[PDB]
Amino acid sequence: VTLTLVCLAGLLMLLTVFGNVLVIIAVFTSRALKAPQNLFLVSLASADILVATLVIPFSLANEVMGYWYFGKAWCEIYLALDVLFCTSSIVHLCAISLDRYWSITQAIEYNLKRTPRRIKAIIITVWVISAVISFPEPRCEINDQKWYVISSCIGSFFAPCLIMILVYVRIYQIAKRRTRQNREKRFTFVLAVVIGVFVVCWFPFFFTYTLTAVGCSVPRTLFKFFFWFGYCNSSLNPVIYTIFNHDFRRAFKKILC
């Protein structure tokens, strides 16, 4: 099944780019969405666009044709250019967590210093951390060295998932001391997806990735399927972080409809 899978990947790419472009446009062309926090949304949407254009077209081929990559010198720079265009996302989900934690736990103190002078620095810090974690017949198997998979796995998806899971179990606590108006299902559900999605899509991959370090019998086909959830998560991301907010929804209604 080649044409069907290629078409499915094409649907993936189209949806990803469409949603991220919509979010990027709605963030700018709207008076209401003028808060500084939206710089993170714009940067994350840009990362989703990049990983949806410069990455998927090649890594779908490498699995479809089932043979030598198209090229031998453009790999050493995309093999680490798809592994840094995801870590950018996985760490922008650990930055939109610290932001949306400090804007609740310490409101008055953080509502000052909540200006672009620091948001830009944070975004540059994320985009340099990603790069630091990216650089460490024949097929281009992702570099699996006994000392590089461990560090990449525990620096790219075990800090950003131990810092957005110890930062969304508080916003659950705070959202219990600050509602007192029978909104139990509101702050209890929407806080379950933003992590429910982030860990159902990704973790099934990283678990096997670093589990190979002990040579466990991970099936090859199932692993090469787990490999492909990262991009679908890069697709699902813009809607998760934008639907619920009222201003984003109004901008979506005004632009799309």
Binding site: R178, F187, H246
Partner: protein, 211 residues
Amino acid sequence: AAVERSKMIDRNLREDGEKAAREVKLLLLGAGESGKSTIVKQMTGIVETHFTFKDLHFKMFDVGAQRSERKKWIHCFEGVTAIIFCVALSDYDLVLAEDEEMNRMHESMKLFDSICNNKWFTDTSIILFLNKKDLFEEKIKKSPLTICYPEYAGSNTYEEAAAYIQCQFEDLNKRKDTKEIYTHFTKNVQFVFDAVTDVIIKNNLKDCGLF
């Protein structure tokens, strides 16, 4: 030339807007004998009172000097982080100066009802203040509160009357699901700090839809 001048003008305007956005604004309202001046002291046209508590920045606009129709200029106050309101508990024993047999507190409720159930302040929360508590606590010892409500049961009492009045005041915000109404019986600025911290946190906790 003109391009550079206008660029510098834009830069200054952006800087001033950024510095101003870090302010909290409080429209202060009350009836004639409400006692808002007492609140201002403790804590023509618009009078702006700028203060700072625990390293914050409040502006409070007193507009009671404006003797004209209220629906024609209230538009300007759509965007205040809260609306402080002041009522006079010793005002249930005063009839309107011009009108006859118009209990001053009834007029105060009418004003507050107009403020709350209004199309502009549909989310802007109110912070209610019930001034002159002690004077009322002494006044009620001879004049039953039933004079000002022919639907009252429970003989004169301060632990009950001041809760019944608060009930009648909180029974007027038909937007029960949108705006909160805090209440304190005039550390008052400490209460305003603790009640605008809640507004700021509950407006941050709604930009992401959690609330």
